[PDB]
Amino acid sequence: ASEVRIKLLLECTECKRRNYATEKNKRNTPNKLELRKYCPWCRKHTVHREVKI
Amino acid sequence: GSTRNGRDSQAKRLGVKRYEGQVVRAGNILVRQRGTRFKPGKNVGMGRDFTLFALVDGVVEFQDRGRLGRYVHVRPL
Amino acid sequence: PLDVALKRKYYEEVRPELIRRFGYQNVWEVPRLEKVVINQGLGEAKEDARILEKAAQELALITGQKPAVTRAKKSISNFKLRKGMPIGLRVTLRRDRMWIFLEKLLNVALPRIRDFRGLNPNSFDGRGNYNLGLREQLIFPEITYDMVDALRGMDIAVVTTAETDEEARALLELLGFPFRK
Amino acid sequence: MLMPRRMKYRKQQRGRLKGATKGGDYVAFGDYGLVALEPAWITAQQIEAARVAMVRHFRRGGKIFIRIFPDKPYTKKPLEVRMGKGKGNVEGYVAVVKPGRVMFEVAGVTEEQAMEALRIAGHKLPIKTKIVRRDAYDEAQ
Amino acid sequence: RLTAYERRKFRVRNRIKRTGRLRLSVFRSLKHIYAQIIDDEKGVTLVSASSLALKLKGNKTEVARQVGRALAEKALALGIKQVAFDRGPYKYHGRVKALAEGAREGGLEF
Amino acid sequence: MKEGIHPKLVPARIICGCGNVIETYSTKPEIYVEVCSKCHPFYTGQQRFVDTEGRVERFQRRYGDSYRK
RNA sequence: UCCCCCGUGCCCAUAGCGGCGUGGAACCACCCGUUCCCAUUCCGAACACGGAAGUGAAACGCGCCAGCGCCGAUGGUACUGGGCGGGCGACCGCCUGGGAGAGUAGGUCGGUGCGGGGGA
RNA sequence: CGCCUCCUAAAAGGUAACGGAGGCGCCCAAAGGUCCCCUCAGGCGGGACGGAAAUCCGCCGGAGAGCGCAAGGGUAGAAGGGGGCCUGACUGCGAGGCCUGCAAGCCGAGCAGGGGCGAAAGCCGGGCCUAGUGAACCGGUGGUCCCGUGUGGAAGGGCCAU
RNA sequence: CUGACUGGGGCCUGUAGAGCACUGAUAGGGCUAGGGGGCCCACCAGCCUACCAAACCCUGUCAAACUCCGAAGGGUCCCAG
Ligand SMILES: NC(=[NH2+])NCCC[C@H](N)C(=O)O
Ligand SMILES: [Mg+2]
Ligand SMILES: [Mg+2]
Ligand SMILES: [Mg+2]
Ligand SMILES: [Mg+2]
Ligand SMILES: [Mg+2]
Ligand SMILES: [Mg+2]
Ligand SMILES: [Mg+2]
Ligand SMILES: [Mg+2]
Ligand SMILES: [Mg+2]
Ligand SMILES: [Mg+2]
Ligand SMILES: [Mg+2]
Ligand SMILES: [Mg+2]
Ligand SMILES: [Mg+2]
Ligand SMILES: [Mg+2]
Ligand SMILES: [Mg+2]
Ligand SMILES: [Mg+2]
Ligand SMILES: [Mg+2]
Ligand SMILES: [Mg+2]
Ligand SMILES: [Mg+2]
Ligand SMILES: [Mg+2]
Ligand SMILES: [Mg+2]
Ligand SMILES: [Mg+2]
Ligand SMILES: [Mg+2]
Ligand SMILES: [Mg+2]
Ligand SMILES: [Mg+2]
Ligand SMILES: [Mg+2]
Ligand SMILES: [Mg+2]
Ligand SMILES: [Mg+2]
Ligand SMILES: [Mg+2]
Ligand SMILES: [Mg+2]
Ligand SMILES: [Mg+2]
Ligand SMILES: [Mg+2]
Ligand SMILES: [Mg+2]
Ligand SMILES: [Mg+2]
Ligand SMILES: [Mg+2]
Ligand SMILES: [Mg+2]
Ligand SMILES: [Mg+2]
Ligand SMILES: [Mg+2]
Ligand SMILES: [Mg+2]
Ligand SMILES: [Mg+2]
Ligand SMILES: [Mg+2]
Ligand SMILES: [Mg+2]
Ligand SMILES: [Mg+2]
Ligand SMILES: [Mg+2]
Ligand SMILES: [Mg+2]
Ligand SMILES: [Mg+2]
Ligand SMILES: [Mg+2]
Ligand SMILES: [Mg+2]
Ligand SMILES: [Mg+2]
Ligand SMILES: [Mg+2]
Ligand SMILES: [Mg+2]
Ligand SMILES: [Mg+2]
Ligand SMILES: [Mg+2]
Ligand SMILES: [Mg+2]
Ligand SMILES: [Mg+2]
Ligand SMILES: [Mg+2]
Ligand SMILES: [Mg+2]
Ligand SMILES: [Mg+2]
Ligand SMILES: [Mg+2]
Ligand SMILES: [Mg+2]
Ligand SMILES: [Mg+2]
Ligand SMILES: [Mg+2]
Ligand SMILES: [Mg+2]
Ligand SMILES: [Mg+2]
Ligand SMILES: [Mg+2]
Ligand SMILES: [Mg+2]
Ligand SMILES: [Mg+2]
Ligand SMILES: [Mg+2]
Ligand SMILES: [Mg+2]
Ligand SMILES: [Mg+2]
Ligand SMILES: [Mg+2]
Ligand SMILES: [Mg+2]
Ligand SMILES: [Mg+2]
Ligand SMILES: [Mg+2]
Ligand SMILES: [Mg+2]
Ligand SMILES: [Mg+2]
Ligand SMILES: [Mg+2]
Ligand SMILES: [Mg+2]
Ligand SMILES: [Mg+2]
Ligand SMILES: [Mg+2]
Ligand SMILES: [Mg+2]
Ligand SMILES: [Mg+2]
Ligand SMILES: [Mg+2]
Ligand SMILES: [Mg+2]
Ligand SMILES: [Mg+2]
Ligand SMILES: [Mg+2]
Ligand SMILES: [Mg+2]
Ligand SMILES: [Mg+2]
Ligand SMILES: [Mg+2]
Ligand SMILES: [Mg+2]
Ligand SMILES: [Mg+2]
Ligand SMILES: [Mg+2]
Ligand SMILES: [Mg+2]
Ligand SMILES: [Mg+2]
Ligand SMILES: [Mg+2]
Ligand SMILES: [Mg+2]
Ligand SMILES: [Mg+2]
Ligand SMILES: [Mg+2]
Ligand SMILES: [Mg+2]
Ligand SMILES: [Mg+2]
Ligand SMILES: [Mg+2]
Ligand SMILES: [Mg+2]
Ligand SMILES: [Mg+2]
Ligand SMILES: [Mg+2]
Ligand SMILES: [Mg+2]
Ligand SMILES: [Mg+2]
Ligand SMILES: [Mg+2]
Ligand SMILES: [Mg+2]
Ligand SMILES: [Mg+2]
Ligand SMILES: [Mg+2]
Ligand SMILES: [Mg+2]
Ligand SMILES: [Zn+2]
Ligand SMILES: [Zn+2]
């Protein structure tokens, strides 16, 4: 982790809860991360979006 | 006058943990190693750090297969 | 497969003469053409107008085959060269397309070569293959003065089933490869 | 004088001097040899003094073979410092020599010359030595 | 010095052997296609089937299928049900695939 | 061959200046060339174009034997 | 249960390199094609399909050859667990039990299981 | 001055000195999962510009290349190179162990939920592996709707995540 | 009755010694790119080297952070005293 390699949260796009923490390099990956992920509240996979940590 | 050395890391306690003929339970670590100095054989799994461990209750057996490497097996009891 | 003069000339005239000249005991033992590989060393397209798509369009008109990009194995300081850079074109001709290319190469191309004194007899693999290089692409009948932006030549590998240079010399010359010495 | 052109490591542990020579125990080139009777670290300067003594005796003619090489760095702390603060600096190089080692050989020279040169050479060395002559025993090695 | 063929063969086979299922090996020549179901723990073949042994005839794909069906019938007779497919150096496709499908139609489990 | 990435090869006439016509295959059905193997000086025996000169020099002067003897 | 071939294992070079010879009935391969399935950062080379005129040239299989590679004693030695001595030391020996590596003699151009197809 | 690698270290583990040498305080949205395919460095010969070294062809070449970065181990019967589809760089747990003064640190089959790749067998709880890190306390933000000082709320706290 | 210690058996190991196959060091010789030098040229090549020398080969060696090898021992589990 660094200024360019930031920590971030993944938010379930359906119920808006933050379910995962991870990182990316915002120089290499300037766009918000979009990833399918299991949401324990929705109890199914869901597109999760990057949200500021 | 001074030294620019003086560093060393902690010893990692690697090696075989269960020798041939030993009675192990499933999950028992058999070998701690760097890379595959020993390869998993029958009823032996391998973890992300090359750790060999028993998949079943049984008796540990070693085998040297020449160019194919040394293997660690577990024989069901 | 297409009826093509050179290919026909190989089976009808060249094979018997070779069987004669060396006395092979097996039909498979006699020198055959395996592939013609064409390579554009380029790398003048490393950066700059790294559109060598102009050259690929040219190679394809010559061979009827679309060349595949070659890329730098490693990065190089002095040639100003980073790993993975598109530096050349390479097309592997076999069978009917190989015959057709050589056919025009002998009849038309090499004659159109400037101050042509004949192919270099010494340019043989040692293992029975041959290689020659060109300065221009204008040599070929497919390419006209209009449609060409700059001068880029190529390497040509002719691969034979022959085990020796002697045998390979025999086959290639029989086909019509014009040697100076 | 003799020392490695290059090395993997600047400094070596001191180690030990047990046993007869590992090898190098038979005349292999010349007619006569100088054999080590005692273990020692033989310095590069000792080796060179031995060499120069032999060519000086020969004047012109003969051939000397030097069969040991000082690749072991010798270490000494700067004068009047205390213990600690790291290993001393490399001051020289030594050849490890054990009993039975043929250190020098000569050729192209009479027996009287070879005996005498090797004798003088021996006086430059920190150990007892023996003069030997090539043998069938050597030849069979 | 191994070949692409030899490496490819080892690669897919090693993976199969790790699972410890009975192994359904398939050899495909220019003319024929062969299958043996192998116990790699005892190093023994259990049941066999081929176009050469069945004197099969026609289209190589349709033949492959038939030797597959055949292998199944004999296999089920010995109580062999579950198996692992050993495509070896061959793509899972065409003739090999056909044999596989024929084995499955026969009730071989994989 | 992969489809749609290659120029199609059609029957073709390459027409040389010497009157040579070559039946072959190409991406352009008709082509004119200034030269071919059939007329090129290197190929045709040794048809030495403009200069079959043979040096001509240097004793080739012979103008003449007139100095006195 | 015998020989040949085709699969597939095991031992893990005594099995390998190189040289030479040999085999196509069968099998295997090359081969003949590229319509179809599938395929090439280009290429039916590969992968794949449909074939069956040809050739064992390539590959593969099987023999023979010890130039290389590989294996390798018996002796003897180094070293040493335990027991004792000697030297001011660097170090040197004895007893008992163990015992190399190098090298020498020599060995090796594989052996074997299971299932197929063929032959006697 | 913590951490990693090698040696010292006396062929299990461990083992000190202001002993001998080097590294870390990152990184990667692929440099991750899976399926399929591919195989190096180097030497020699051949080939326009082209060179010791750019790309091409042939032969030899078991690993001396590669594996982001130190070193060691490992490794082509891939962990290396390319492509397709992807997000398991899961949630809820966890038999059994390694290591170990404590607290930590490490490996982990298997079961369930909902998935990814694959015909399948199967693999997938990040990364060839060992460094890339920091206990409590105090406080922030998202969620939860557990407590709510007579009662309903609210203030403020708890719990889950960061 | 499981203990220290001991007998048998299996597995694990990389030290002593040794070796040079790997990483490096290494004297001499041979062979042979590369320079230095000398004849002979600027017409671009040639010839000679008791010169410094890469790679390779031979002979002979060196190594805690080298290993194609490799003990005695040591460790651990099982049965027995
Ligand atoms: N286990 C043994 N016998 N060791 C012998 C070495 C003892 C002594 N240093 C000697 O040279 O004699
Ligand atoms: Mg310092
Ligand atoms: Mg230190
Ligand atoms: Mg430290
Ligand atoms: Mg320590
Ligand atoms: Mg420690
Ligand atoms: Mg350590
Ligand atoms: Mg161990
Ligand atoms: Mg794992
Ligand atoms: Mg991993
Ligand atoms: Mg055993
Ligand atoms: Mg077993
Ligand atoms: Mg033919
Ligand atoms: Mg030549
Ligand atoms: Mg050839
Ligand atoms: Mg033209
Ligand atoms: Mg000391
Ligand atoms: Mg001294
Ligand atoms: Mg000292
Ligand atoms: Mg002082
Ligand atoms: Mg000190
Ligand atoms: Mg000192
Ligand atoms: Mg000194
Ligand atoms: Mg010595
Ligand atoms: Mg003296
Ligand atoms: Mg010797
Ligand atoms: Mg298509
Ligand atoms: Mg077979
Ligand atoms: Mg052979
Ligand atoms: Mg024959
Ligand atoms: Mg043969
Ligand atoms: Mg036939
Ligand atoms: Mg026949
Ligand atoms: Mg088509
Ligand atoms: Mg059709
Ligand atoms: Mg084809
Ligand atoms: Mg094929
Ligand atoms: Mg046919
Ligand atoms: Mg043949
Ligand atoms: Mg094959
Ligand atoms: Mg023999
Ligand atoms: Mg051996
Ligand atoms: Mg030996
Ligand atoms: Mg002995
Ligand atoms: Mg003792
Ligand atoms: Mg002592
Ligand atoms: Mg002794
Ligand atoms: Mg003794
Ligand atoms: Mg004894
Ligand atoms: Mg030993
Ligand atoms: Mg021995
Ligand atoms: Mg052999
Ligand atoms: Mg076999
Ligand atoms: Mg067996
Ligand atoms: Mg049989
Ligand atoms: Mg039979
Ligand atoms: Mg240690
Ligand atoms: Mg240690
Ligand atoms: Mg230890
Ligand atoms: Mg110890
Ligand atoms: Mg422990
Ligand atoms: Mg300090
Ligand atoms: Mg530091
Ligand atoms: Mg990718
Ligand atoms: Mg992928
Ligand atoms: Mg190469
Ligand atoms: Mg070249
Ligand atoms: Mg050039
Ligand atoms: Mg070049
Ligand atoms: Mg490497
Ligand atoms: Mg991949
Ligand atoms: Mg999808
Ligand atoms: Mg536990
Ligand atoms: Mg603990
Ligand atoms: Mg730690
Ligand atoms: Mg599941
Ligand atoms: Mg599922
Ligand atoms: Mg699933
Ligand atoms: Mg599916
Ligand atoms: Mg599944
Ligand atoms: Mg799991
Ligand atoms: Mg990685
Ligand atoms: Mg990592
Ligand atoms: Mg990876
Ligand atoms: Mg941590
Ligand atoms: Mg904390
Ligand atoms: Mg406090
Ligand atoms: Mg708080
Ligand atoms: Mg709250
Ligand atoms: Mg409430
Ligand atoms: Mg209230
Ligand atoms: Mg109210
Ligand atoms: Mg209430
Ligand atoms: Mg409210
Ligand atoms: Mg609240
Ligand atoms: Mg938390
Ligand atoms: Mg008792
Ligand atoms: Mg006990
Ligand atoms: Mg006990
Ligand atoms: Mg005991
Ligand atoms: Mg030693
Ligand atoms: Mg060495
Ligand atoms: Mg030697
Ligand atoms: Mg030593
Ligand atoms: Mg040594
Ligand atoms: Mg050491
Ligand atoms: Mg050592
Ligand atoms: Mg040995
Ligand atoms: Mg032992
Ligand atoms: Mg013991
Ligand atoms: Mg024991
Ligand atoms: Mg007892
Ligand atoms: Zn949700
Ligand atoms: Zn013409």
How would you describe this protein?
The structure is cut from a larger assembly and holds chains A (53 residues), B (77 residues), C (181 residues), D (141 residues), E (110 residues) and F (69 residues). Chain A has 53 residues and is an all-beta fold. Chain A is built from no helices and 4 strands. Chain A has a 4-stranded antiparallel beta sheet, with no helix packed on it. The radius of gyration of chain A is 11 Å and the shape is elongated. The two termini of chain A are 13 Å apart. Chain D has a single domain (29-137), classed as Aldehyde Oxidoreductase, domain 3 (Alpha-Beta Complex), CATH 3.90.1170. In chain D, helix 1 packs antiparallel against helix 2 (111-122). Chain D starts with 31 loop residues before the first strand and ends with a helix. In chain D, the strands form 2 sheets. A 4-stranded antiparallel beta sheet of chain D has the order 3-6-1-7, covered by helices on one side. In chain D, strands 2-5-4 form a 3-stranded antiparallel beta sheet. The longest helix of chain D has 15 residues, at 44-58. In chain E, helix 3 runs parallel beside helix 4 (94-105). Chain E starts with a helix and ends in a 5-residue tail after the last helix. Chains in contact: B-D, C-F. Chain C binds 3 RNA strands through strand 1, helix 2, strand 2, strand 3 and helix 3. Chain F: One of its GO terms (biological process) is translation. Chain F: It comes from Thermus thermophilus (strain ATCC 27634 / DSM 579 / HB8). Chain F: Belongs to the bacterial ribosomal protein bL31 family. Type A subfamily.
Structural class of chain B: mainly beta
Oligomer: part of a larger assembly
For the record, give the distance between the C-alpha atoms at the N and C termini of chain B, rounded to a whole number. 64 Å
The strand line-up of the biggest sheet of chain B is 1-3-6-5
Order of helices and strands of chain B: EEEEEEEE
Q: What is the CATH top level name of chain B? A: Mainly Beta
What is the name of the CATH superfamily of chain B? Answer: RNA polymerase II/Efflux pump adaptor protein, barrel-sandwich hybrid domain
Rg of chain A (C-alpha, Å): 11 Å
Spatial gap, N to C terminus of chain A? 13 Å
Rg calc of chain B: 16 Å
Number of strands of chain B: 8
Helix percent band of chain B: under 10%
Q: Strand share of the residues of chain B?
A: 35-45%
How large is the share of residues in beta strands of chain A? over 45%
> Structurally, how many domains make up the residues of chain B?
1
Any ligands, ions or cofactors bound here, and which? Answer: arginine, magnesium ion, zinc ion
Number of beta-strand segments of chain A: 4
Structural class of chain A: mainly beta
CATH names the topology of chain B as OB fold (Dihydrolipoamide Acetyltransferase, E2P)
PDB class: ribosome
Keywords: rRNA modofications, beta-thio-aspartate
Entry title: Crystal structure of the Thermus thermophilus 70S ribosome with rRNA modifications and bound to protein Y (YfiA) at 2.3A resolution
Chain A: 50S ribosomal protein L33
